[PDB]
Structure formats: structure tokens, C-alpha cells
Design a protein around this ligand. Structure first.
Ligand code: GTP
Ligand code: GTP
Ligand code: GTP
Lengths: 99, 51, 33, 438, 427, 49, 31, 105, 438
């Protein structure tokens, strides 16, 4: 169980990193204005026009990852409770036998 | 005993108790004594000062 | 508040004569047909 | 510039302020950390927020409020909640004991010592303040402790500063529900020790809130979450004048000048028109005519005083959202022509219109629908005296045989004050009938 | 902050304190040995109301146990939690008591008041601020009245600004075991009503009726009776220790409950009881909560308040509820019977709502009430006293001890006057 | 105006991702602690044999 | 009508004995 | 303590954010005469003959109001209920509220 | 150039002398080796340190201080401790016996045989001294031994030299806290034997140092380390004028003129406003107006006195860091306009102002904040009658019982000294009072 939890932690951490960099990039972008600097002739090209994703698909990506993490957390909780109860019962029965 | 009337008379002659001036300090500031605090007292009023 | 004691007693007698039909403090309007 | 200061007394008022800020943060988009994204709006505190925050170069907004409490539990919970970094660490005053429904206990025994701290705080925010149009006092009348503390702080601020506003909002006692039979005592204590100082008092009742809730919002077990959300929307609406622009602007001082007719009687009622659930609004329509008619419908008020029992003196309405002066004035003219609404013979004009384009906002994960036209309504009408008759016939009964009075007389008061209060109120009712009579 | 020092006396107390403290410990999740394990961060936070902190993260009970018979001490030490109390906190005598309240009020306490006061005020100095104290004993307690009267009278002026709650078990009307027990009751009750602010009264016959009415369990133990009363006391005190919007403080309750100085007495009553199939048959809902909440069956303290009238009612609810439902609930009950409630007060209902559930059950509540339904108890005791007194039965023990009949006379004057008091208020 | 709208829409997801990662880490802590408790109990078991 | 956010730029205040007037930067709604 | 001149916008409760007026200031004084002879000795002990303000100081019912129209006898009572408290009428920041109003008929 | 001498008497003194020089090496950048790093300022000991050291071709800075003590313990401790290689062994003057809380023991029994060494070391530093504006003499009042010793050595130096300044610091008797029943005796003895040669004595109450140390330093278990950093910061503030520059600069002689009006009384009181922690400061703002208001809050004075019941005679404000005269004068004008402050009819102006560009520093392990504005306030006011009143009433009662007389008479004094002290303080009461009379 520890193994699985750590793996999912790593994956979600990765995607969060990605979102942070993209958001910061666009923040740095947005303060532009017509009169200001950072203003150049760069020619057209298809790399500027490339397409890689669509909003709903990206949303569903994120949604799937979230739900995966949620299920693993639930499973961990369940196993924890089961282990606790087994410990208790073991101790009590050995006590009675010795008495 | 018309103890209704008796309690009425009791409360009517209830007069009062008086409070004691005690201040507070902080977030959870304690009810630190005030009157003879030394901090903010009224002490220069006695018939020895100067003479 | 009424600038004339006269208007005071006048409006008061008007209200006490109209007492029965009003609603309430017996002050609100009876309305209704 | 433009700003006002919020004061909160009572584990009663801490909640309703908590919800007010839970809303107030979102509209200008302040994260619960206390910081925006890295953009350039921070400085000396000069943008939209400046009317309720002073966000200096620290990049942290300072809630212009003081939260005082006597029982540390709920205030400690907000201390350990999300907004702890937002709240200013010793604007959150906590005490160790309560007044236990005893107005006089709160007014003498423990009221004497927190006042120094509160005076400190008010002056040391006023320093950095510049405009300070006034203050918003949050309290209750069935005050378990908010009675004496509020009274004495109010009089102290009245006698230290005299030349500005005091607006009072309160959960009013129910006509026939009482969580403390000591309320019929402490409420009148508060009233007749505040009238000489209080500028503008306003009341609202949780039962009528419930009743609206299950007549139209279709919520069978709402909560304090819902109630405080509604109240927060109301106060936000009345502050929208400062917050956002509009066709015209009005101010709380205008409220004072235009609403209260005389010295003394300053007790109007509050109402919010476009209450409806999203599903119910969906296949209907909201427009100026029906929204105004509904907000004057007798079964939408939050105090149990049917206006037909009373007579109107003044009306102020603030339209928030997209509206136009043409139908505004047409609708109010139609209302004036309408027969049943009986305005007293004095006021020729009695209608403070107020307009603002800004659409009101929902609270995320809240309860209300999506509305493009709201009106908040303040109304001064004679219908109030019914509740005061209720109170006096409660008071004479349970006072004439002197029940529970021993606690008070022992802890330090006498019977002269309870003597004076009754004829204070009696003079109030004779004043109400005299002012009504035409 | 403001906290509590708990006093337990008599063998009644020797049961009650042990059971009640282990109940609170099992609530706040501490092993009997002492080491904590955090599950409810809020229960971790609010602990100074009862437990002073001992190093190693152990939380000593600020309680004091006193009696005269060493064996009860030995048992309450050898029980499942004996390690949890302090060898400090065991003050005791050497002689047997024998239920002779005269000796218990002069002959043995006179030389142990010093030690008991030393220890209790040591704990008072240890803590910061006290609501007051609560005392677990029996007025029919053969040693209970003897110790309690003296210690109460002392602590009155020791700390005259406080809340000295009293929790006592009333002698059974049907059987008193001890025959001088009516004497014990009549002697104790004078100082009790002369000093107390709030005093509970609970009878065990109605508990046995509970045993055959909802417990249905054949063979109950006095320990389980103690379990019931401990649940009640816990519930009335829960408002202080947990968050959620309600008013908690004891005199916050008291000013609302009492109308007048000599009114001090109350009845408890518990919330949903359930037989072996009614677990899988009970719909846990506010309506049935309020219904059984107001039941003469559920009534268990003295007798059915059917025969008298309720002056005041206070109710605490415990769990995840709202307020509109409790509001409509009482509204319903006052409209069902406005005659039964007195007219000298309107709105005689008081409510509080604690959000934190007890351990195990979600919906819960509890009651405290002031009614004109207690004439029966002390009236009964009055006839018992007059009967045995009619020709100085058993009086020689006390006249050898040092008492005399005049004391008995003013005690009975107190009782009869109080009866007329309650009556002519409710009339 | 369009780009600003996009920015806010991103900020939302960023917030929830952070929060959920935090609860995940706390759960890892708790489970590790209980595992160590089990280990020492297994240690304790051996003597009565 | 697509305008959504409507805030004002506080271009006027005092800050000290003499009042002060700013340079207009953001208009109706911020632009 | 006396006031400044001309540049009379930058020195006010406008910037104190005072809401309890400071002190009655002035630019009003004639040419004083006298050499300012000496009546102290070495410390500030005035010579006995010359007088001083001989330790005259050494070292809630109030409510600002306009009488307007509240019942005449109540107005008369309110006058006293405002005054008759020299303690909160004399000193220690003055502590002085005002009055406005009109009589009845 | 601009330089002074430093003197510490008693275990009471070498404490905070250690604290002060511990600090004074940091901000100027000294390593406890005593030699400057690879960079170059060493020579004939003349750079900014030169006002406090002479780093001669030896290579080591040498503090211009003498640590005189009657008891070998503390001097041996500091010798074995960290900074000995800096320190100069014999100017750590140590004695063999204690004055045992007896003023006369310190003034006659021991003083004769050690004052010779004291004055000899003083002169052998004075020879190399050039500017020698004044001294920093550190002692106490409830002195275990330092009191009478300081008085007598001060007499020696006051009669040998009389054309300079002498600065006096002594922890004031804790109002209701005593570590000596002989404290009123030795205090008043020092007072009447020193009232006529000193220049400027400033007080402080370590109770109040603690009281602020848990009001806003937010620790319930402070130490002397914390108290000593506070006071060392104060002395650093007063010497900052020498150490650095600014728009305008002020000096000790200006202090001695401007603060005290008259002979006898030369006893004003100090205050330091921005005593704040990093955690508290994290999300608040610091600036001139609020720091002035805080430094004049009635409970931020570290001695038990009331502004309200007192009346001001003088105030000097010392600002360090980044400020402007504009808002400086604005704040001071607000102070004048305030009413609670009640200046005596004497002073038209009341405010000596000094400014330095240089923000103070911090120390690792230190618990102050990282502040950008510092103000040291020195005020003379009538609010200090209660201190000497308490002292005299306590002393007069326990002298009426006349215990410990046997001690002093046995060691060889009498009561005439006591008589003179009594008449002196009896004078001083009305001395403070008729000047207030106006
Ligand atoms: N403002 C507000 N009022 C509430 C809320 N919940 C209930 N109330 C009403 O507010 C009143 C609370 O007053 P009190 O309980 O006396 O509060 P207090 O006087 O400050 O002191 P306490 O008795 O300890 O709470 C109750 O009568 C309720 O009817 C709430 O969340 N907010
Ligand atoms: N411990 C215990 N007490 C019981 C039980 N049943 C009834 N009691 C009551 O406990 C009461 C008294 O407890 P204590 O105050 O300790 O009594 P005491 O002063 O030591 O002397 P006694 O009353 O004669 O026992 C008795 O009056 C009984 O009615 C039981 O089963 N166990
Ligand atoms: N300077 C200083 N004073 C302290 C310190 N701690 C407490 N004090 C106060 O300073 C006074 C110290 O005086 P004494 O103990 O008489 O010292 P002494 O007169 O030089 O001679 P001894 O009796 O040997 O200590 C005490 O009255 C304390 O109130 C400290 O570390 N340094």
C-alpha cells in the first residue's frame, strides 16, 4: 500500500509542477502593452499554429487523475482500520488463554 | 407566609454589591489586579507628601 | 409635535370615533369592501 | 478616503461577520492566504479593496474590523480555521468569562476591563484611516453577553467622537420564541440605554428568514450557513454604493438623513427581493415590475409586522444590477398610485431611489440563484409597534411578581432602572400613536 | 482558563466517580495507563477544563476521593483504572462510619477537615480560574451527608463567588434499607437547601422500571446504573468542552433555570433508549427524539411530573442537527399542552445545541427540568420522620453523640415551609 | 479580456491540486506511523513463546 | 454589455497635509 | 500652543483623524510689555507674594443632543441629566459636550 | 575625536557591559579573535570603531571600558569565557570582599584601597584620550555592592574633573519587587550622596521590561538575555549619533542642556517603540505615525508612570533608518494637537529631534524583528512622584521601627545621614510639585 501511495503522489506532483510553470509564463506575458518594450518582428510559421489539446479533453485528464488519487486514499483508510482491529483481537485472545 | 411578598421585599431592599476595578492585558490576558497595581494607581494623595 | 393643541384634540377625537372599524393597537386600516 | 470599520460583539455576531468576509474576499479575488497573484495592485492600499482593507506594502489585506469575544471557543475556532493569516492576530480579542444573559453583569462586572483594549484598537486604526464614513456594529438583542458590553462601548465611542454615523443591525426577538426568558429584560435594558445615543437601529428575525426559506427557496433544513449568507449579501448590497459606481451614488449618511423622521424613532425594516432557487428561477423571468411588487408584497418581510397593520413614512430602495431609469420611475409611480399601500399624509415624496449597474454575486457552493436584478429595501412604517406591545405585556406580567430579579440585585443593580424602563417604553408607544394619528 | 475540581465522597461516590471518570477517559481517547493518542484534535485542545497536565503527556484527574472505610479505596484502586488517581488524592480515616450522621458530622470529620481542605485548596492554587466544584455523593449516604455538609459549609466562605453543583441519589421511597435513613435525609436536606445552587435528585426504583421497560436485560448491575447517571452528567457538561454554537456555562444555565433563592432542585432525563430489536427498528429522527424526550416513561428521577406542572425546561442536543426542527418541536409541545406549563412564566423552554456527537451514536440529547413534581419525595420523608420521631425512636445514639431535639425541630420547620413554598408558587 | 479569463480559470485548478496533495502527504505520514507501531508489536510477541 | 468587472482607480487622496492627484492609468473596469 | 498662519489646510483634525477637537487656537495678541522680572528662586519656587494658578487643577448620561421636540418636562430633565457632572465637565481633556435645540409650545 | 569612556561597577554591571560590547562588535564587523578580516582598516586604531576602540599596531581593538567588581566570580567567568582575547586582563579589576548590601561597607570599609587603582587606570586612559566628551557609568540603586562604590568613585572624578559630561544608568527599584530589604536604605543613601555631582541619570524597571517582553515579544519564559539585548539596543541607539551621520546630528551635551530644566532633578525616562517579533511583523506595516503613537501609548513606558496623571516638560525623539522630515513633522504636529498629552504651561516647544539614515541591526539568536524604522524617546514628566513616594513611605515606616540600624552603627555610621536623606526627599516632593503648579 505504501508503494502505491507514493507512486500516485509523484505523478500528481509532476502535473502540478507543469501547471505552475505555464501559469507563471502567461502572467509574465500579460503585462505587455502597445507602447512598451518586448516588441519585435518574428515571422509567421506553423509551429505557432500547432495544436495539441482541447479544453474538455484537458479537463477530463485532470478529473481522472484526481479521482484516482481519491480512491487510493479511501483504500488506505480501510486497510488501516482492519489492521487495528486484528491487533486488538490478537492481544485479547492470547491474554485469555494465559489466564 | 406570603413568601411572594417576602421575596418582593427582599429584592426591593436588595441594594447592591459593588465591583472592584481590575483590568486586562492581552489576547487571553489574565484578570491582573488593578487598584494597587503600581502601574496605574492613585497614590499621591496622602498627608505626608513633601512636608 | 402637532403645532396646535386644537389639531391634537381634533385628530384624537377623529381616531377615537373611528376606533371600532380600524384593525389592530386598533390603528391599522380595516380595508375590505 | 472611503472606508468604514466593523465591530463584532457576541459569539452571535462573530459568525455573521465570518460569513461576510467569506464573501467579501471573493469579489476582489483575494486568496485565503491574504495575497493576490503577483500583479501590481498593492502599494499604500489604493484600489477597490481600500474601503474595507488597508493593504500596505506588506501585500496583506488588513480586515478593518475588531472581533471581541468573552468565551474563547468559537473565536478560537476561527483562529484555527482557514483565514487565520487573514485576520489580524490581536484584532481577535478573547475573554475568559461570560455575562450569562445578565445585561448588568456585562455592563458592570466584566465590561470595565476590555474597554481599554477596544479603545486602543479603534484609535490605532483611526490613525491610518482618512475618510472613515462610519462603523458597523454587530450584536444581538437577546444578548447572552452582547448586551452590556455593546451598550457601554457604544456610549464610550459616542462620548469620545460625536460627529459621525452609527448604524445598528440586530437579530430581533421572536414574537413567540425565546431562547432565554431573560431576553424580555435585557432587550429593553439595551433599548432604553441606547436610544439616547443610537443613530439608526435596524432589526431582522430568524423565524421569518426560515419561513421565506421554505416557502420559496425549497430548503427544508437550512442553517446558519444559509442565514449568515443572506445577511452578508444584505450588508454587501448596502455597501455596494462605496464598492461600485452607478448612475448615482448614495451614502449611509444619506440613509440617516432621509429615513428617520424624528429624534427617537429610528427603527426601520430590511428586505431583499429576488430570493429564489436556481431551478425555480430557470423557467421564469425576473424584471423590474414583478421584483418591486414582490419586495412590497406583505409576505416577504423578515419581521412579523404586517404592513397593513401599519402606515408607511419612508422608503429607500437600491437597485443592483442592470436596470434603467425609465421603468424605475414608471414602476414607483404605479406603486404610489396603488391603493392598499397607505402612506401617511405628510410625505409627498418618500422614495429614495438608488441605482448601480454592478450585478450581485453568488457565493461559490452557496444556495441562491443567478440574478441580474436585485433590489434591497429599507422601509420605515408604523407597523412596528405590534412587537413593542408584545414586549410590554410580556414584561409587566413576568416582572410584577419579581421573578429572577434577585440575581441582578445581588450582582449590583437596583430596581430604579427597571422602574424607569417601563415608562420609557410607554412613552414610546404613546409617541407611536401620536405620530401615526393624522 | 476556567476549570473544575471534582469531589467524590461516600461509597456511593466510590462507585460513581470511578465509572464516570473512566467514561470521560474513553470519550477523550486516553488509555487507562495515561499515554495519549490523538484522533480528535479538538479533544486534544480542550482538556484543561478537567485534566491538569503531567509530564510524559499524562493528564491527572483533578478529583479527590474521600471516605472512612479502606476497603472501598482498595477496590477503586484495584479496578480497571486504579493507576489513574494520585496517592495524594486519597485522604481517609481509620474508624468505621456506620451511617451515624451525628458522628459523621462531628466525631470523625472534625479532625480530617484540615487535611481535606489542604489538598483541595492545593489543587485550587494549582489551577487558574474555577467555575466552582461538583460533588458526587448520596444524601442518604451514611457517610455522605456527614462529610458533605461540613465540607460544603466550609467551602461556601472559602470561595463565595463560585458554582457548587451537587449530584446526589435520593433514598428509595419503597425501601430505605437503613432505618435511621429518614433521619439522615431530614438532617442533611436543611443545610443542603440552605447552601446549594443546583442539586440533582435521582431515584433507583424508576431506574429499575427502566430496566424492565427499555433495558430488558434481565440482570443489571449497579455499575450499569452508574453508567446511566454518568452519561447524564457527561451530557450536561459537554457544552463547555467542545465547539459548536451554544451557550455552555453552568450559571448561564442556572439563572435561566432557578426563579428564586430557595429554588435549587432538578431532575435529569436521558435520550433514546433502545431494546434489542428496536436498534434495527428505530428511525433516528428529531420527532421521535422529542417525543420520548418528553415521556413519563423516560422520566426516571422522582415520579411522573404528570401530577405537577413544569416551571422550566432546559434541553441539550448533541450531534449534527439544525434548529428549525427543535424550534417547531417545542412550539408543538407548548401548543399541545399550554395548560401544563405555568402561566407565571411564558416561553419556559430553553435549548442548546452541541455539534460534537458522543462516541458511537449520532443523534443524542438530554434533559434537565424544574417542575412542581417534587412535593412527593420530601413529603414522604416528612411522614417517615414524624412517625419514627413520634416517640423518640433511636434517639439515644444521637443524644449520646451530642445532638439534641431542637436541631430536629428546625430541620422539620425548614422542610414543611419549603413544601408550602413550592405549592403556593405553583398555585 | 479573454486572456485574463483564462488566467483565473487556471488559478482555480492550481489551488485544488495543492490542497489535495497536502492531504495525501498527511495520510502517508499516518500510515507510516501505524506501520512502525505494528513492527514493534511484532517485536514484543516473541518472549512468551 | 459584455463588461463584467467595474472597479475605479483611486486617483485622488491626501496622504499628507496637501492633497495629491495621480496620473490616470486604469479606466472603467481596469484597462 | 498658539496657531500657525496662512497655510491653514495642512494642520487640522483632517489629518489627525481627530474627532474630539484639539484646542482653541489663535493668532491674536497685542504687544506685551514688561521686562519679565523674576519671581522664582533657583528651581521654580515662585516667590510667595506673587500669585499663580495656585494648584487649581494641581495636576452614560452625557449625550450630544438637540432639544428639538421631546416632551417639555423630559427636555428639562435632560438638561440636568447632561449637566451636574463637573467631573465630566471640567478638565482631563476638558470633557465637554455641546447643546442645540428649540423650546416647546 | 568624538569618543567617550565606559565604566561598569558590580555583578549588576558586567552583565550588561558584556551584552553591550557583544553587540558593539557585531554591527561594526569584528571577529572575536580581535583582528579584522582580509580587508583593511587596521592601523593606529582610527576608523569608525575608534570612538570605542584603539586597534593599534598591536592589531586588536581594545574597548575603552573598565570593569570594576568587588567579587571575583563574574570577572573570572568573563575572563574564562569567550571574549577574553579581546579583553584587557587587568582593567577587569576584581576585589576580595563584598560590601554585603551595606552602603557604608562599600563607601568606607573597601572603597579606600581600590579607588586608587581605579583612578590610576582612568588617568592612563585619559592621557591617550583626546576628545573625551564623557562617560557611560553603569550601576544600580538596590545595589548588592555597586551603589556606594559608584557614588564615591563618582565623587573622586567629579572633584578632579568638572568640565565634561557624566551619564548614569541604574535599574530603578522594582515598585513591589525586592531582592533586598536594605534596598530603600542603600537607594536613598546613593540618592542624597549623588544628587549634586551627576549630570543625567535615566531609569528603567526590569519588571516592565518583562511585561512588554510578554505583551508583544510573545514569550512567557524570557531571560535576562532578552532584557539585556533590549537595553544594549538602547545604548546603541544613543551612540548612533557618534557612530554615523545623517541630515542632522545631536550630542550628549545637547541632551544635558535640553532635557533637564533645573538643578536637582535630572531624571527623565526612556522608551523604544518598535519592540516587535518577526512572526508578528510578518503581515503588518511599520511607519512614522503609528510608531509615534505606539511609543506614546501609556503602557509602553518601561517604568510605572501615567501620562494622564503626569504632565510633560520635555521630549527628545531620535529616529534611525529611512525617514523624511515631512512626515516626521506631520507626526509631531499630531502629537502636539492631541489632548491626552498635557504639556506644562512652561515649554512652548518641547521636542528635540534628531535623525540618522542608518537602520539598526539584528543579531543571530536575537529575538527582535528586522525593522526599518527606529525611534528612541526620552521624556521628562511629572508622572514620577509615586516612585519616590513609595520609597519614602516604606523607608519611613521601617526606619520608625529602626531595624538594621545595628548593622550600620556597628560598621561605624550613624543616623544623621538618614536624617539628611529624609529632608532631601521631603524637599524633592514639593520640588516636583510646585513647578507643576501653574
Ligand atoms: N448574530 C447571530 N445570532 C445568532 C446566531 N445564532 C443564534 N443567534 C441569535 O443570537 C442570540 C445570541 O445571543 P447570546 O447567546 O446571549 O450571545 P452573548 O450575549 O454575546 O453571549 P452568550 O450567551 O455566551 O452567547 C440568540 O438569542 C439567537 O437567537 C448566529 O449565528 N449569529
Ligand atoms: N457502591 C454502591 N452503593 C450503593 C449501591 N446500591 C445503593 N448504594 C447507595 O450508596 C449510598 C451511600 O454511599 P456512601 O455515601 O458512600 O455511604 P456511607 O456514608 O459510607 O454509609 P452508607 O450510606 O450506610 O453506605 C447508600 O445509601 C446506598 O443507597 C451499590 O450497589 N453499590
Ligand atoms: N546589572 C544587573 N542587575 C541585575 C541583574 N539581575 C538582577 N539585577 C538587579 O540588579 C541588582 C544587583 O545588585 P547586587 O546584587 O547588590 O550587586 P552588587 O551590589 O554589585 O554586589 P553583590 O551583593 O555581591 O551582588 C539587583 O537588585 C537586581 O534587582 C543583572 O544581570 N545585571
Amino acid at each position: 500500500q505504501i508503494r502505491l501511495n507514493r507512486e500516485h503522489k509523484e505523478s500528481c506532483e509532476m502535473n502540478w509542477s507543469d501547471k505552475v510553470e505555464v501559469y507563471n509564463i502567461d502572467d509574465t506575458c500579460s503585462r505587455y502593452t502597445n507602447e512598451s518594450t518586448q516588441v519585435q518582428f518574428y515571422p509567421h510559421s506553423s509551429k505557432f499554429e500547432e495544436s495539441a489539446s482541447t479544453p474538455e479533453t484537458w479537463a477530463k485528464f485532470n478529473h481522472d487523475n484526481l479521482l484516482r488519487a481519491e480512491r487510493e486514499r479511501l483504500a488506505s483508510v480501510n486497510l488501516r482500520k482492519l489492521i487495528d482491529c486484528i491487533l486488538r483481537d490478537t492481544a485479547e485472545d492470547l491474554r485469555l488463554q494465559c489466564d | 407566609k406570603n413568601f411572594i411578598n417576602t421575596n418582593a421585599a427582599d429584592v426591593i431592599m436588595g441594594v447592591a454589591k459593588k465591583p472592584k476595578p481590575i483590568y486586562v492585558d492581552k489576547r487571553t490576558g489574565d484578570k491582573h489586579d488593578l487598584e494597587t497595581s503600581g502601574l496605574f494607581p492613585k497614590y499621591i494623595n496622602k498627608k505626608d507628601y513633601g512636608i | 409635535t402637532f403645532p396646535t393643541e386644537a389639531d391634537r384634540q381634533r385628530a384624537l377625537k377623529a381616531h377615537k370615533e373611528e376606533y371600532a372599524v380600524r384593525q389592530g393597537l386598533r390603528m391599522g386600516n380595516y380595508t375590505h369592501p | 478616503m472611503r472606508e468604514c470599520i466593523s465591530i463584532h460583539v457576541g459569539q452571535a455576531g462573530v459568525q455573521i461577520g465570518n460569513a461576510c468576509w467569506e464573501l467579501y474576499c471573493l469579489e476582489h479575488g483575494i486568496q485565503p492566504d491574504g495575497q493576490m497573484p503577483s500583479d501590481k495592485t498593492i502599494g499604500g492600499g489604493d484600489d477597490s479593496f481600500n474601503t474595507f482593507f488597508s493593504e500596505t506594502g506588506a501585500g496583506k489585506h488588513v480586515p478593518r474590523a475588531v472581533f471581541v469575544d468573552l468565551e474563547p471557543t468559537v473565536v478560537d475556532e476561527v483562529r484555527t480555521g482557514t483565514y487565520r493569516q487573514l485576520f489580524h492576530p490581536e484584532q481577535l480579542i478573547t475573554g475568559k468569562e461570560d455575562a450569562a444573559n445578565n445585561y448588568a453583569r456585562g455592563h458592570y462586572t466584566i465590561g470595565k476591563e476590555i474597554v481599554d483594549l477596544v479603545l486602543d484598537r479603534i484609535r490605532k486604526l483611526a490613525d491610518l484611516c482618512t475618510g472613515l464614513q462610519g462603523f458597523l456594529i454587530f450584536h444581538s438583542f437577546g444578548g447572552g453577553t452582547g448586551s452590556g458590553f455593546a451598550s457601554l462601548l457604544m456610549e464610550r465611542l459616542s462620548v469620545d467622537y460625536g460627529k459621525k454615523s452609527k448604524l445598528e443591525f440586530a437579530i430581533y426577538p421572536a414574537p413567540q420564541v425565546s431562547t432565554a426568558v431573560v431576553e424580555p429584560y435585557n432587550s429593553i435594558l439595551t433599548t432604553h440605554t441606547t436610544l439616547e445615543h443610537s443613530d439608526c437601529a435596524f432589526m431582522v428575525d430568524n423565524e421569518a428568514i426560515y419561513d421565506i426559506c421554505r416557502r420559496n427557496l425549497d430548503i427544508e433544513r437550512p442553517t446558519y450557513t444559509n442565514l449568515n449568507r443572506l445577511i452578508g449579501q444584505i450588508v454587501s448590497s448596502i455597501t455596494a454604493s462605496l464598492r461600485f459606481d452607478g448612475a448615482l451614488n448614495v451614502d449611509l449618511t444619506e440613509f440617516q438623513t432621509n429615513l428617520v423622521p424624528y429624534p427617537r424613532i429610528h427603527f426601520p425594516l430590511a428586505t431583499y427581493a429576488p430570493v429564489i432557487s436556481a431551478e425555480k428561477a430557470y423557467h421564469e423571468q425576473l424584471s423590474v415590475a414583478e421584483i418591486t411588487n414582490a419586495c412590497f408584497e406583505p409576505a416577504n418581510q423578515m419581521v412579523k409586522c404586517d404592513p397593513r397593520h401599519g402606515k408607511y413614512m419612508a422608503c429607500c430602495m437600491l437597485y443592483r444590477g442592470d436596470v434603467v431609469p425609465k421603468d424605475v420611475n414608471a414602476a414607483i409611480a404605479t406603486i404610489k398610485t396603488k391603493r392598499t399601500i397607505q402612506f401617511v399624509d405628510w410625505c409627498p415624496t418618500g422614495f429614495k431611489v438608488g441605482i448601480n449597474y454592478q450585478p450581485p454575486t453568488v457565493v461559490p457552493g452557496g444556495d441562491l440563484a443567478k440574478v441580474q436584478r436585485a433590489v434591497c429595501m429599507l422601509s420605515n412604517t408604523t407597523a412596528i409597534a405590534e412587537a413593542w406591545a408584545r414586549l410590554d405585556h410580556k414584561f409587566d406580567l413576568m416582572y410584577a411578581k419579581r421573578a429572577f430579579v434577585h440575581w441582578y440585585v445581588g450582582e449590583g443593580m437596583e430596581e430604579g432602572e427597571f422602574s424607569e424602563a417601563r415608562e420609557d417604553l410607554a412613552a414610546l408607544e404613546k409617541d407611536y400613536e401620536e405620530v401615526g394619528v393624522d | 482558563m476556567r476549570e473544575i475540581v471534582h469531589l467524590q465522597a461516600g461509597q456511593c461516590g466510590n462507585q460513581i466517580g470511578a465509572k464516570f471518570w473512566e467514561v470521560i477517559s474513553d470519550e477523550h481517547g486516553i488509555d487507562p495507563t495515561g499515554t495519549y493518542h490523538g484522533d480528535s484534535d479538538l479533544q486534544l485542545e480542550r482538556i484543561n477544563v478537567y485534566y491538569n497536565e503531567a509530564t510524559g503527556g499524562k493528564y491527572v484527574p483533578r478529583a479527590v476521593l474521600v471516605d472512612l472505610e479502606p476497603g472501598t479505596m482498595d477496590s477503586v484502586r484495584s479496578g480497571p483504572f486504579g493507576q489513574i488517581f494520585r496517592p495524594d488524592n486519597f485522604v481517609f480515616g481509620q474508624s468505621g462510619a456506620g451511617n451515624n450522621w451525628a458522628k459523621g458530622h462531628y466525631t470523625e470529620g472534625a479532625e480530617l477537615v484540615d487535611s481535606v481542605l489542604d489538598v483541595v485548596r492545593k489543587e485550587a492554587e494549582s489551577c487558574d480560574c474555577l467555575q466552582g466544584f461538583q460533588l458526587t455523593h448520596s444524601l442518604g449516604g451514611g457517610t455522605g451527608s456527614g462529610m458533605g455538609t461540613l465540607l460544603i459549609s466550609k467551602i461556601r466562605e472559602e470561595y463565595p463567588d463560585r458554582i457548587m453543583n451537587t449530584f446526589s441519589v435520593v433514598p428509595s421511597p419503597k425501601v430505605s434499607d437503613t432505618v435511621v435513613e429518614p433521619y439522615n435525609a431530614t438532617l442533611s436536606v436543611h443545610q443542603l437547601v440552605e447552601n446549594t445552587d443546583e442539586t440533582y435528585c435521582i431515584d433507583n426504583e424508576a431506574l429499575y422500571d427502566i430496566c424492565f421497560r427499555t433495558l430488558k436485560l434481565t440482570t443489571p448491575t449497579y455499575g450499569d446504573l452508574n453508567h446511566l447517571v454518568s452519561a447524564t452528567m457527561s451530557g450536561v457538561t459537554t457544552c463547555l468542552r467542545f465547539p459548536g454554537q451554544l451557550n455552555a456555562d453552568l450559571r448561564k444555565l442556572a439563572v435561566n433555570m432557578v426563579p428564586f433563592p430557595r429554588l435549587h432542585f432538578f431532575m435529569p432525563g436521558f435520550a433514546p433508549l433502545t431494546s434489542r430489536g428496536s436498534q434495527q427498528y428505530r428511525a433516528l429522527t428529531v420527532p421521535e427524539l422529542t417525543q420520548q424526550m418528553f415521556d413519563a416513561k423516560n422520566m426516571m428521577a422522582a415520579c411522573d411530573p404528570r401530577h405537577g406542572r413544569y416551571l422550566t425546561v432546559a434541553a441539550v442536543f448533541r450531534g449534527r442537527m439544525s434548529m428549525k426542527e427543535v424550534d417547531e418541536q417545542m412550539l408543538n409541545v407548548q401548543n399541545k399542552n399550554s395548560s401544563y406549563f405555568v402561566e407565571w412564566i411564558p416561553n419556559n423552554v430553553k435549548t442548546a445545541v452541541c455539534d460534537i456527537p458522543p462516541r458511537g451514536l449520532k443523534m443524542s440529547a438530554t434533559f434537565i427540568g424544574n417542575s412542581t413534581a417534587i412535593q412527593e419525595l420530601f413529603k414522604r420523608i416528612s411522614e417517615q420522620f414524624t412517625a419514627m420521631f413520634r416517640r423518640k425512636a433511636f434517639l439515644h445514639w444521637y443524644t449520646g453523640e451530642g445532638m439534641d431535639e431542637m436541631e430536629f425541630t428546625e430541620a422539620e420547620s425548614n422542610m414543611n415551609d419549603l413544601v408550602s413554598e413550592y405549592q403556593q408558587y405553583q398555585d | 479580456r479573454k486572456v485574463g479569463e483564462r488566467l483565473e480559470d487556471m488559478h482555480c485548478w492550481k489551488s485544488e491540486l495543492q490542497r489535495e496533495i497536502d492531504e495525501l502527504s498527511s495520510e502517508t505520514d499516518l500510515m507510516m506511523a501505524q506501520k512502525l507501531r505494528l513492527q514493534r508489536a511484532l517485536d514484543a510477541t516473541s518472549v512468551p513463546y | 454589455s459584455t463588461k463584467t468587472a467595474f472597479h475605479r482607480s483611486q486617483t485622488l487622496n491626501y496622504r499628507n497635509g496637501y492633497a495629491v492627484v495621480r496620473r490616470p492609468t486604469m479606466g472603467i473596469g481596469g484597462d | 500652543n498658539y496657531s500657525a498662519n496662512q497655510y491653514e489646510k495642512a494642520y487640522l483634525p483632517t489629518y489627525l483623524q481627530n474627532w474630539s477637537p484639539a484646542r482653541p487656537t489663535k493668532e491674536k495678541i497685542a504687544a506685551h510689555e514688561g521686562y519679565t522680572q523674576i519671581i522664582a528662586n533657583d528651581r521654580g519656587h515662585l516667590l510667595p507674594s506673587v500669585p499663580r494658578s495656585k494648584a487649581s487643577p494641581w495636576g452614560i448620561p452625557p449625550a450630544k443632543v438637540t432639544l428639538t421636540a421631546r416632551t417639555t418636562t423630559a427636555a428639562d430633565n435632560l438638561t440636568k441629566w447632561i449637566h451636574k457632572n463637573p467631573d465630566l465637565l471640567n478638565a482631563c481633556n476638558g470633557l465637554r459636550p455641546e447643546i442645540s435645540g428649540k423650546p416647546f409650545d
